Amino acid sequence: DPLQQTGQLFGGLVRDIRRRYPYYLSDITDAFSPQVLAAVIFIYFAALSPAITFGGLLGEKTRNQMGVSELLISTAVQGILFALLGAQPLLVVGFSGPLLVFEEAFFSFCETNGLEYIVGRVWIGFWLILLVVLVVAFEGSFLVRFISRYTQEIFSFLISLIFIYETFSKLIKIFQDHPLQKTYNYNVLMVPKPQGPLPNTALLSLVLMAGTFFFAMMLRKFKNSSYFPGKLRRVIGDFGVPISILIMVLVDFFIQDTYTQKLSVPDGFKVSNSSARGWVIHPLGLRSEFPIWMMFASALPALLVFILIFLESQITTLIVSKPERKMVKGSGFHLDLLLVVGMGGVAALFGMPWLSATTVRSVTHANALTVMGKAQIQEVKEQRISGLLVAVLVGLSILMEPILSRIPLAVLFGIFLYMGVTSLSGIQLFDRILLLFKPPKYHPDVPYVKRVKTWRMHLFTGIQIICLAVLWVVKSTPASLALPFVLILTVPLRRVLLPLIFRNVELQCLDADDA
Amino acid sequence: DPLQQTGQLFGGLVRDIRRRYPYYLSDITDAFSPQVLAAVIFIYFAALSPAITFGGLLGEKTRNQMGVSELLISTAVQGILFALLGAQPLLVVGFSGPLLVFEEAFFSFCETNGLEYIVGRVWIGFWLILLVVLVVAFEGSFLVRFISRYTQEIFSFLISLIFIYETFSKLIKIFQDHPLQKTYNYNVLMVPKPQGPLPNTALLSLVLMAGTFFFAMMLRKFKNSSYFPGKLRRVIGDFGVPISILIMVLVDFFIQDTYTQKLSVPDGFKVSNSSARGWVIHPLGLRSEFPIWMMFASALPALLVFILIFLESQITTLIVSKPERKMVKGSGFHLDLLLVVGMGGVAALFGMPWLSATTVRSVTHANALTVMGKAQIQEVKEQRISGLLVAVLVGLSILMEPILSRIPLAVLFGIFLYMGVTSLSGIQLFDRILLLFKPPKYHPDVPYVKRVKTWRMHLFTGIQIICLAVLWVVKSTPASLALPFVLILTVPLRRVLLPLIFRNVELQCLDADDA
Ligand SMILES: CCCCCCCCCCCCCCCCCC(=O)OC[C@H](COP(=O)([O-])OCC[N+](C)(C)C)OC(=O)CCCCCCCCCCCCCCCCC
Ligand SMILES: CCCCCCCCCCCCCCCCCC(=O)OC[C@H](COP(=O)([O-])OCC[N+](C)(C)C)OC(=O)CCCCCCCCCCCCCCCCC
Ligand SMILES: *[C@@H]1O[C@H](CO)[C@@H](O[C@@H]2O[C@H](CO)[C@@H](O)[C@H](O)[C@H]2NC(C)=O)[C@H](O)[C@H]1NC(C)=O
Ligand SMILES: *[C@@H]1O[C@H](CO)[C@@H](O[C@@H]2O[C@H](CO)[C@@H](O)[C@H](O)[C@H]2NC(C)=O)[C@H](O)[C@H]1NC(C)=O
Ligand SMILES: CC(C)CCC[C@@H](C)[C@H]1CC[C@H]2[C@@H]3CC=C4C[C@@H](O)CC[C@]4(C)[C@H]3CC[C@]12C
Ligand SMILES: CC(C)CCC[C@@H](C)[C@H]1CC[C@H]2[C@@H]3CC=C4C[C@@H](O)CC[C@]4(C)[C@H]3CC[C@]12C
Ligand SMILES: CC(C)CCC[C@@H](C)[C@H]1CC[C@H]2[C@@H]3CC=C4C[C@@H](O)CC[C@]4(C)[C@H]3CC[C@]12C
Ligand SMILES: CC(C)CCC[C@@H](C)[C@H]1CC[C@H]2[C@@H]3CC=C4C[C@@H](O)CC[C@]4(C)[C@H]3CC[C@]12C
Ligand SMILES: CC(C)CCC[C@@H](C)[C@H]1CC[C@H]2[C@@H]3CC=C4C[C@@H](O)CC[C@]4(C)[C@H]3CC[C@]12C
Ligand SMILES: CC(C)CCC[C@@H](C)[C@H]1CC[C@H]2[C@@H]3CC=C4C[C@@H](O)CC[C@]4(C)[C@H]3CC[C@]12C
Ligand SMILES: CC(C)CCC[C@@H](C)[C@H]1CC[C@H]2[C@@H]3CC=C4C[C@@H](O)CC[C@]4(C)[C@H]3CC[C@]12C
Ligand SMILES: CC(C)CCC[C@@H](C)[C@H]1CC[C@H]2[C@@H]3CC=C4C[C@@H](O)CC[C@]4(C)[C@H]3CC[C@]12C
Ligand SMILES: O=C(O)c1cccnc1Nc1cccc(C(F)(F)F)c1
Ligand SMILES: O=C(O)c1cccnc1Nc1cccc(C(F)(F)F)c1
C-alpha cells in the first residue's frame, strides 16, 4: 500500500520515488492520444481563470503586494516543477479560496501590527519548508490512510457545491453591475471598464453561460451515445468543452455592439506594485527593520497554512487515486506533500503565493483523461505533459492576451458549472443523495442498498448533510480558516460516533475503500 | 374497417354515427382524469396563439374584412359543434397556413376584379357545402384507405418542420425589431407597440423561450423517469407544459422594467371593421351588386379549398387514429369531413373563416392524452370535453384579456418548439432519418431493419427527403396552393415508382399499416 510506515527516515519519500519514477517513460509517452490535448485546452481555461479571479481579489485586498502577475508566475513555475517531479502529475497545483481567505487575513493582521506583509510570508514560508521536511522525515503523510471515504465524500461534495455556488455568484454579479433598466446612460467611460450599467450585457452573459454549459452536457451525452462512427464520436466527445467554448466564443465575436466582460491579464511580466516591493523580498525588512518576534511567531500561521495545503492536497490525491478509477501508475503522498508545500514556502521568498493541489481542477483533469466504454472505466490516461502544458500556458497567459481578450467570462462560467456537475460523477454521497428522492423499489443494485436497510442507509446519508451544513456555516462565519479542523473532526465521527450508532456490516458496505 | 365502400347512399356517414355514438358516454366520462385537464391548458395556448397570429395576418392583409375577432369566434363556434358532434373529437379544428395563403390570394384577386371579398367567400362556402355532401353521399371519404404511411409520414414530417421553422422565424423577428445596439432612443411611444428598438427585449425573449422549452423537455424526461413516487411523478409529468409556462410567465412578471411582446386580443366581441361589413354578409352584394359569374365561378376556388381542408383533415385523422396508438373508440372520416367542411362553408355566410383539422394541435392533443408505461402505449384517453373546453376558452379568450396580457409570446414559442419535436415522436420517417447518422451495427431491432438491407432501407428514407425538398420548394414559390396536388402525387409514387424500384417484401416491412 502507498501509506505503509517504512520506519527508515524518509522511507515514504524514497518508496514514492521507487514507485513512480520507473514508469517515467509511460508518464511522457501516454500523452500522444488526442484526449490528452483536449484535456490541456479544457484544464488550461480551468487553471487560468482562477489565477485571474483570485489574482485580482488579492491585489484589490493587499494593495498590489501580490496580484495577478505573482499568482500567474507561481501557478506557472510550481506547475512545471510539479508536472516533472510530482508522484501524481494529474494533481493540478494552484491557488484556492482557502488560501485567498488566509492571505487577506494575514494582510489585515500585518497592517494592524505594523508589519511588512510581503516580508511576513517569507518567514511563514521557512516554517512550511521546515514543518513539511519534519513530517516527510517521520512518514507523517501515512495519516492519509486514516482519511476514510466518508470524509473524502464530504470533501468531494462541499468543494463541488462551493465551485458551483461561486460560478452562479459570478453570473449574479453581472446582473447587479448591469441590471435590466428601462433607460441607460451612454455618456459612460469603458477604458478601465463600464462605469455605469449597460443594456444587453447581463442577458447575453446568461445566454453565453447557458449555451456553453448546454453544448458541454450534450457533447458529454453524445460521447457515450450510439450516433456517428466510434472513431469520430469519441474525438468529438473528448474535445467536448473545447468545442463548447469555441462555438460560444465565436457567438459573442459576431455580436459587435453589445459589451460583456472578457479575460483580463496584466501588460507584461512585471511586479504588480514596483513602489511596494521587488521580485526577491528581503527577510529582515524590505524598508522598515522586521521584528524578531514575527521571524519566529510566523510558525503559528505556517502550522495553519500547512494544514490547509495538507488536507486540500492529500484528500484530493485520495479522491483522484481511488481504486474504482483505473489508476495503473499509483500515487505518492510523501513526495506530493513535500513538493506542494516546499515549493510554496520557497515561492514566498519571491513574494508569490504558495499553492495547493485543488480537487475540482485535479478531479476535472483526471475525469477529462478517464476513458469510458459500453458504462464503466477501462484505462485512465496517466501522464505529465497534460499537467505540464497547462502550467506552461498559464505562464504564457500574459503573452497570449490578444487570443484571451476575445473570450468572455460568461462562456467560462458555463464550463465551471459543467466542471461542478462533472466532479459529482463518482461520489457515493451524491449518488446516495439521489436515492433520497427515488422510491425504495427503484434503488440501484449495490452492496450498501442490498446488505443495509434503506431507512438506515438514508440516516447515514442524512448525517453527512448535517456535516455539510456545519461545514457550510463555518465557511460564511468570520472563523473560516477553522474549516480544516472541522473537516479533520469528520474522522473522529466515522471512527467513534458512526460505529457507535451503526452496525459494522453497514459501514464496510456504505464506507468501502473500493467498489 | 372504417373506409369500406357501403354502396348504400350516406352509408359511410351512418356507419361512422353507428360506430362512435354508442361510446358517447365514454366520450364524456373519460375526461375526469387529471391528464385531460393538463391537455386542456396546454392545447388552449396551442389553439389560441395561432388564432391571434393568423387573425392579425388576415386583418393586416384583408383590411379588417376578417381578423382576430372572426377567427376566434369561428375557432370557438366550430370547435364546440365538432367537439359534441365529431367522430374523432381529438381532431382540434382551427385555421392553418394553407388557408391563410388562400384567403390573402382570394382577396388579392377580389380587389383586382372589383369584387366584395367577404361576399365572394359566401359563394365559395355554398360550393364547399355542395361538394362535401356530394362526396359524403358516394362515400368518397373511403379514398383515405389509399393514403399510405409513406404519404402520412411526409405530411407528419413536412408540417412538423414548418411549425418548428415558423416558431424560430417568430423569435428571429424580435431580434430584427429590437436588435442588440450600442445606443437606444427612449423618446419612443409604447401605446400601439414599441415604435423603435428597445434594450433587453430580444435576449429576455430568447431566455423566456429557451427556459420554457428546457422546463418542457426536462418534465417530459421526468415523466418517464425513476425519481419521486409514481402517483406524484405522472401528475407533474402530465402537467409538464402547464408548469413550464407558469414558471417562465412568473419569471417575466417579476422583471418590471424590460418590455417584451405579450398576448393581444381585441377590446370585445365586435366586427373588426364595422365600415366594411356586418355580422351576416349578403350574397347578392353587401354594397355593390355582386356579379352572377362569380356566384357560379366561386366553385373553382371551393374545389381548391375543399382539397386543402380534405388532405389536411383526413391525413391528420389517419395519423391521430393509427393502429400503433391505443385507439379503442376508432374514427369516422365521412362525418369528420362533413362537419369540418360543412361548418366552414356555413361560417363564410357570417364572414367568419372556414377551418380545417390541423395535424400538430390534433397530434399534440392526442400525444398529451396518450399515456406511457415501463416504454410503450397502454391507453389513449379518448373523450370530447378536452376538445370542447379548448374551443370554449378560445371563445372566452377576449373576455379573459387581463390573464393573457401577462403571458409573453416568447414563453409560447418555447412550447411551439416542444410541440414541434413532440409531434415527431411516433414518425418512422424521422426514426429512419436518425439511422442515417447511426452506424449500421447499432440500428434498432425492427422488421424494416432486419428483413430489408440497410443500404436499400436508407434509399427509401432518401427518396422521402427528395419529396420533402420538392414539397418545401413549392411552399416558398408563388404557386403555394398547388402543394395539396404535389402531396396527392406522393400516392402515385408509392403505388408505381417505389414498387417498381423496390421488392414487395421491403415495402410491406418499410410501409406497414400497423407495427
Ligand atoms: C434538453 C435541452 C433543453 C435546453 C434548452 C436551451 C438550450 C440552451 C440555450 C441554447 C443553446 C446555445 C445557442 C446560443 C445562440 C445565441 C443566440 C443569440 O442571441 O445570438 C445570435 C443572435 C443575436 O443577435 P445578433 O446581434 O448576433 O444578430 C446578428 C446580425 N446583426 C448583427 C446584423 C444584427 O440571435 C438570433 O439571430 C436569434 C437566434 C437565437 C438562437 C436560437 C435558440 C432558441 C432558444 C430555444 C431552444 C434552443 C435549443 C434547444 C436545445 C435542444 C435542441 C432540440
Ligand atoms: C440536458 C443537459 C442540458 C440542458 C440544459 C441546457 C442549459 C441551459 C438551459 C436553458 C434554460 C435555463 C434554465 C431554465 C430557465 C431559468 C432561466 C431564467 O429565466 O432565469 C435566469 C435569470 C433571468 O435574468 P435576470 O437576472 O434579468 O432575472 C430577473 C431579475 N432582474 C430583472 C431583477 C435583474 O437570471 C438569473 O438570475 C440567473 C440564474 C439562473 C442561472 C442559469 C444559468 C444557465 C446554466 C444552466 C442551468 C439550467 C440547466 C441545468 C440542468 C441540466 C443539466 C444538469
Ligand atoms: C503601492 O505601494 C505603495 C507603498 O510602497 C502604497 O502606498 C501606500 O498606500 C496606502 C493606502 O493605499 C497608504 O496607507 C500608505 O501610507 C502608502 N504608503 C506609501 C509609502 O506610499 C500604494 O498604495 C500601493 N499602490 C497600489 C498599487 O496599491
Ligand atoms: C374599413 O372598411 C373601409 C370601407 O371599405 C375601408 O376603406 C377603404 O380603404 C381602402 C384602403 O385602405 C381604399 O382602397 C378604399 O377606397 C376604401 N373604401 C372606402 C369605401 O372607404 C377601410 O380601409 C377599412 N379599414 C380598415 C380597418 O382596414
Ligand atoms: C536537507 C533538507 C533541509 C532539504 C529538504 C529536502 C530533504 C527532505 C531531502 C534532500 C536530500 C534528501 C536525501 C537524499 C538521499 C537519501 C539517501 C536515501 O538512501 C535515503 C533518503 C535520503 C537520505 C534523502 C532524504 C530526503 C532528503 C534529506
Ligand atoms: C479560441 C478558443 C476560445 C478555443 C480554442 C479551442 C481549440 C484549440 C480546439 C477546439 C476544437 C479542437 C479540435 C477538435 C478536433 C480535433 C481532431 C483531432 O484529431 C486533432 C485535434 C483537433 C483538430 C482539435 C484541435 C484543437 C481545437 C481546434
Ligand atoms: C516552456 C516552459 C519551460 C516555460 C513556460 C513559462 C515561462 C515562459 C515563464 C515562467 C516564469 C517567467 C519569468 C518570470 C519573471 C521574469 C522576470 C522579468 O524581469 C523578465 C521575465 C521573466 C524572466 C519571466 C520570463 C518567462 C517565464 C520564464
Ligand atoms: C441542514 C438540513 C438541510 C439537514 C437535512 C438533513 C435531512 C436530509 C435528513 C435528516 C433526518 C433524515 C431522515 C431520518 C429518518 C428517515 C426515516 C426513513 O424511513 C426514511 C429516511 C428519513 C426520512 C431520513 C431522510 C433524510 C433526513 C430528513
Ligand atoms: C339537403 C340534403 C339533400 C343534403 C344534405 C344531407 C345531410 C342533411 C345529411 C345529414 C344526415 C343524413 C341522413 C342520415 C340518415 C339517413 C338514413 C339512411 O338510411 C339513408 C340516408 C339518411 C336519410 C341521410 C341522408 C343525408 C343526411 C340528411
Ligand atoms: C397563468 C398561466 C400562464 C398558467 C396557467 C397554468 C395553471 C392553470 C396550471 C399550472 C399547474 C397546474 C396544477 C398542477 C397540478 C395539479 C394537481 C392535480 O391533482 C390537480 C390540478 C393541479 C392543481 C393543476 C391545476 C392547474 C395548474 C395550476
Ligand atoms: C360555454 C360555451 C357554450 C360557449 C363558449 C363561447 C361563447 C361564450 C361565445 C362564442 C361566440 C360568442 C358570440 C359571438 C357574437 C356575438 C354577437 C355580439 O353582438 C354579441 C355577443 C355574441 C352573441 C357572442 C357572445 C359569446 C359567444 C356566444
Ligand atoms: C438534395 C439533398 C438535400 C440530398 C437529399 C437526398 C440524400 C439525403 C440521399 C440521396 C442518396 C442517398 C444515399 C444513397 C445510398 C447510400 C448508401 C448507404 O449504404 C448509406 C446511405 C447512402 C449514403 C444514402 C444517404 C442519403 C442520400 C445521400
Ligand atoms: O471554501 C472556503 O471558502 C474556505 C475558506 C477558508 C478556509 N477553508 C475553506 N474551505 C476549504 C475548501 C477546500 C479545502 C479545505 C481544506 F483543505 F482546508 F480542508 C478548506
Ligand atoms: O403550408 C403552406 O405554406 C401551404 C400553403 C398553401 C397551401 N398548402 C400549404 N401546405 C399544406 C400544409 C398542410 C396540409 C396541406 C394540405 F392539406 F392541403 F394538403 C397543405
DSSP string across B324-354: SS--SS---HHHHHHHHHHHHHHHHHTTPPP
Amino acid at A317: T
The residue to mutate among B206, B212, B418, having the most atoms of ligand 1 within 8 angstroms of its beta carbon, is: B206
Tally of CA atoms within 13 A in the half-sphere of B410 that contains its CB: 26
Instruction: Determine the Cα–Cα distance for residues B160 and B166; give it in Å rounded to an integer.
Output: 10
Instruction: Determine the Cα–Cα distance for residues B360 and B416; give it in Å rounded to an integer.
Output: 10
Closest Cα to atom 54 of ligand 1: B421
Torsion of CA A423, A428, A433, A437, to 10 degrees: 110
Instruction: Determine the Cα–Cα distance for residues A76 and A70; give it in Å rounded to an integer.
Output: 10
Which phi and psi angles does A357 have, rounded to 5°? -95, 90
Closest Cα to atom 17 of ligand 13: A312
Torsion of CA A51, A53, A59, A65, to 10 degrees: -10
Q: How many helices (H) and strands (E) does chain A have?
A: 24, 4
Instruction: Please state, as a whole number, how many other Cβ atoms lie within 10 Å of the Cβ of residue A39.
Output: 32
Helices B385-396 and B68-85: crossing angle in degrees, nearest 10, is 160
Q: With contact defined as beta carbons under 8 Å apart, do A122 and A283 qualify? A: yes
Q: With contact defined as beta carbons under 8 Å apart, do B391 and B48 qualify? A: no
Instruction: Determine the Cα–Cα distance for residues B33 and B25; give it in Å rounded to an integer.
Output: 15
Instruction: Determine the Cα–Cα distance for residues B316 and B93; give it in Å rounded to an integer.
Output: 11
Which phi and psi angles does A147 have, rounded to 5°? -70, 105
B247 SS3 class = helix
A324 SS3 class = coil
Closest Cα to atom 24 of ligand 9: B10
Q: Which one, of A109, A340, A258, lies nearest residue B181 by Cα?
A: A258
Instruction: Determine the Cα–Cα distance for residues B53 and B45; give it in Å rounded to an integer.
Output: 12
Cell numbers describing residue B100 = 391563410
For residue B380, list its beta bridge partners: B370
Q: With contact defined as beta carbons under 8 Å apart, do B449 and B457 qualify? A: yes
For residue A380, list its beta bridge partners: A370
Instruction: Determine the Cα–Cα distance for residues B12 and A500; give it in Å rounded to an integer.
Output: 79
Nearest CA distance, A182 vs chain B (angstrom): 5
**Helix, strand, coil content of chain A in percent (nearest 5):** 65, 5, 30
Instruction: Determine the Cα–Cα distance for residues A209 and A205; give it in Å rounded to an integer.
Output: 6
B11 SS3 class = helix
Pairing of strands A376-380, A93-94: unpaired
Which among A182, A186, A203 is the nearest to B204, CB-wise?
A203
CA B149 to chain centre: 19
Q: Which atom of ligand 8 is least distant from the CA of A458? A: 21
CA A422 to chain centre: 13
Instruction: Determine the Cα–Cα distance for residues A55 and A94; give it in Å rounded to an integer.
Output: 11
Q: Which atom of ligand 10 is least distant from the CA of B411? A: 3
Instruction: Please state, as a whole number, how many other Cβ atoms lie within 10 Å of the Cβ of residue B405.
Output: 11
Q: With contact defined as beta carbons under 8 Å apart, do B87 and B264 qualify? A: no
Resolution of the structure in the document, Å: 3.2
Query: What H or E segment, with its residue span, contains residue A376?
Result: strand A376-380
Instruction: Determine the Cα–Cα distance for residues B47 and B82; give it in Å rounded to an integer.
Output: 14
Instruction: Determine the Cα–Cα distance for residues A205 and A261; give it in Å rounded to an integer.
Output: 8
Residues of chain A positioned with their CB less than 8 A from the CB of B180: 200, 204, 255, 257-258
Q: With contact defined as beta carbons under 8 Å apart, do A389 and A48 qualify? A: no
> Please, which residues have CB within 8 angstroms of residue B183's CB and are 6 or more apart in sequence?
A186
Instruction: Determine the Cα–Cα distance for residues B99 and B80; give it in Å rounded to an integer.
Output: 20
Question: A439 and B204 in contact by Cβ < 8 A?
Answer: no
DSSP A23: G
Q: With contact defined as beta carbons under 8 Å apart, do B366 and B325 qualify? A: yes
Which phi and psi angles does A379 have, rounded to 5°? -150, 120
Question: B199 and A204 in contact by Cβ < 8 A?
Answer: no
**H helix runs in A350-408, sequence order:** 359-369, 385-396, 401-404
Instruction: Determine the Cα–Cα distance for residues B369 and B382; give it in Å rounded to an integer.
Output: 8
B508 SS3 class = helix
- Which bin fits B351, alpha (ψ -120 to 50), beta or left (φ > 0)? left
Question: A258 and B180 in contact by Cβ < 8 A?
Answer: yes
Torsion of CA B223, B229, B230, B232, to 10 degrees: -70
Q: Which atom of ligand 2 is least distant from the CA of B258? A: 32
How far is the centre of ligand 5, averaged over its atoms, from the C-alpha of A10 (Å)? 7
Nearest CA distance, B490 vs chain A (angstrom): 30
- Which bin fits A88, alpha (ψ -120 to 50), beta or left (φ > 0)? beta
Cell numbers describing residue B265 = 386580443
Q: With contact defined as beta carbons under 8 Å apart, do A9 and A213 qualify? A: no
Q: With contact defined as beta carbons under 8 Å apart, do B471 and B487 qualify? A: yes
DSSP B179: -
Q: With contact defined as beta carbons under 8 Å apart, do B86 and B361 qualify? A: no
Nearest CA distance, B201 vs chain A (angstrom): 9
Instruction: Determine the Cα–Cα distance for residues B88 and B334; give it in Å rounded to an integer.
Output: 11
Beta-carbon pairs below 8 A across chains A and B: 62
Cell numbers describing residue A196 = 455605469
Cell numbers describing residue A42 = 479544457
Residues of chain B positioned with their CB less than 8 A from the CB of A210: 207, 210
For residue A356, list its beta bridge partners: A94
Beta strands in B339-457 (DSSP E): 356-357, 370-373, 376-380
Instruction: Determine the Cα–Cα distance for residues B327 and B366; give it in Å rounded to an integer.
Output: 10
Nearest CA distance, B409 vs chain A (angstrom): 18
Ligand index nearest the alpha carbon of residue A262 = 6
Which among B186, B226, B438 is the nearest to A442, CB-wise?
B226
> If interface means Cβ-Cβ distance under 8 Å, which residues of chain B face chain A?
180-184, 186, 199-200, 203-204, 206-207, 210, 226-230, 255, 257-258, 434, 437-439, 442
Residues of chain A positioned with their CB less than 8 A from the CB of B233: none
Cell numbers describing residue B329 = 373508440
How far is the centre of ligand 2, averaged over its atoms, from the C-alpha of A167 (Å)? 13
Through-space distance between the first and last CA atoms of chain B, rounded to whole angstroms: 17
Torsion of CA B331, B333, B339, B342, to 10 degrees: 180
Closest chain B residue to A206, measured at CA:
B207
DSSP A76: H
Q: How many helices (H) and strands (E) does chain B have?
A: 24, 4
Residue that the C-alpha cell 465557511 belongs to: A475
Instruction: Determine the Cα–Cα distance for residues A26 and A381; give it in Å rounded to an integer.
Output: 10
The residue to mutate among A41, A228, A238, having the most atoms of ligand 6 within 8 angstroms of its beta carbon, is: A41
Q: What angle do CA A448, A451, A454 make, to 5 degrees?
A: 65
Which phi and psi angles does A66 have, rounded to 5°? -145, 120
Instruction: Determine the Cα–Cα distance for residues B262 and B119; give it in Å rounded to an integer.
Output: 33
- Which bin fits A10, alpha (ψ -120 to 50), beta or left (φ > 0)? left
Closest Cα to atom 20 of ligand 2: B251
Q: Which one, of B412, B461, B415, lies nearest residue B436 by Cα?
A: B461
Instruction: Determine the Cα–Cα distance for residues B121 and B112; give it in Å rounded to an integer.
Output: 16
> Please, which residues have CB within 8 angstroms of residue B485's CB and are 6 or more apart in sequence?
B307
Cell numbers describing residue B74 = 369561428
Q: With contact defined as beta carbons under 8 Å apart, do A161 and A421 qualify? A: no
Cell numbers describing residue B85 = 358532434
DSSP secondary structure string for all residues of A33-66: SHHHHHHHHHHHHHHHHHHHHHHHHHHHHHTTSS
Burial class from Cβ neighbours inside 10 Å (0-12, 13-18, 19+) for residue B315 reads buried
Instruction: Determine the Cα–Cα distance for residues B58 and B71; give it in Å rounded to an integer.
Output: 9
Which phi and psi angles does B406 have, rounded to 5°? -100, 5
Q: With contact defined as beta carbons under 8 Å apart, do A458 and A436 qualify? A: yes
Nearest CA distance, A434 vs chain B (angstrom): 8
Torsion of CA A221, A227, A230, A233, to 10 degrees: -50
Q: Is B459's C-beta closer than 6 angstroms to any atom of ligand 12?
A: yes
Instruction: Determine the Cα–Cα distance for residues A141 and A314; give it in Å rounded to an integer.
Output: 8
DSSP secondary structure string for all residues of B68-136: HHHHHHHHHHHHHHHHHH-S-TTS-EE--HHHHHHHHHHHHHHHHHT--HHHHHHHHHHHHHHHHHHHH
B282 SS3 class = coil
Dihedral of alpha carbons B389, B390, B395, B399, sign: positive
Cell numbers describing residue B484 = 395539396
Residue that the C-alpha cell 349578403 belongs to: B282
Instruction: Determine the Cα–Cα distance for residues A172 and A319; give it in Å rounded to an integer.
Output: 31
For residue A8, what are the CA distances in angstroms to A3, A330, A342, A387, B382? 14, 21, 21, 31, 81
**H helix runs in A257-408, sequence order:** 292-297, 299-320, 333-349, 359-369, 385-396, 401-404
Beta strands in A168-317 (DSSP E): none
Q: Which one, of B62, B140, B48, B2, lies nearest residue B352 by Cα?
A: B62
Closest chain A residue to B203, measured at CA:
A203
Q: Burial code of A305-335, b = ≥16 C-beta within 10 A, e = fewer?
A: bbbbbbbbbbbbbbbbbbeebebebebbbbb
Nearest CA distance, B118 vs chain A (angstrom): 44
Amino acid at A248: M
Instruction: Determine the Cα–Cα distance for residues A351 and A277; give it in Å rounded to an integer.
Output: 8
- Which bin fits A182, alpha (ψ -120 to 50), beta or left (φ > 0)? alpha
Cell numbers describing residue B333 = 372520416
How far is the centre of ligand 3, averaged over its atoms, from the C-alpha of A70 (Å)? 18
Cell numbers describing residue A141 = 503523510
Pairing of strands B376-380, B356-357: unpaired
Cell numbers describing residue A446 = 449495490
Query: What H or E segment, with its residue span, contains residue A93?
Result: strand A93-94
Most A-contacting residue of B200, B226, B248, B432 (CB-CB within 10 A), to test interface: B200
Instruction: Determine the Cα–Cα distance for residues A245 and A251; give it in Å rounded to an integer.
Output: 10
Question: B200 and A204 in contact by Cβ < 8 A?
Answer: no
Closest Cα to atom 26 of ligand 12: B462
Closest Cα to atom 22 of ligand 3: A63
Instruction: Please state, as a whole number, how many other Cβ atoms lie within 10 Å of the Cβ of residue A275.
Output: 7
Through-space distance between the first and last CA atoms of chain A, rounded to whole angstroms: 17
Question: B180 and A439 in contact by Cβ < 8 A?
Answer: no
How far is the centre of ligand 7, averaged over its atoms, from the C-alpha of A446 (Å)? 51
The residue to mutate among A10, A127, A129, having the most atoms of ligand 5 within 8 angstroms of its beta carbon, is: A10
For residue A237, what are the CA distances in angstroms to A46, A372, B280? 18, 11, 64
Instruction: Determine the Cα–Cα distance for residues A128 and A119; give it in Å rounded to an integer.
Output: 15
Instruction: Determine the Cα–Cα distance for residues B39 and B368; give it in Å rounded to an integer.
Output: 6
Instruction: Please state, as a whole number, how many other Cβ atoms lie within 10 Å of the Cβ of residue A96.
Output: 24
Contacts 24+ apart (CB under 8 A), B437-445: B437/A227, B437/A228, B438/A226, B438/A227, B438/A228, B439/A228, B439/A229, B439/A230, B442/A226
Dihedral of alpha carbons A178, A183, A186, A189, sign: negative
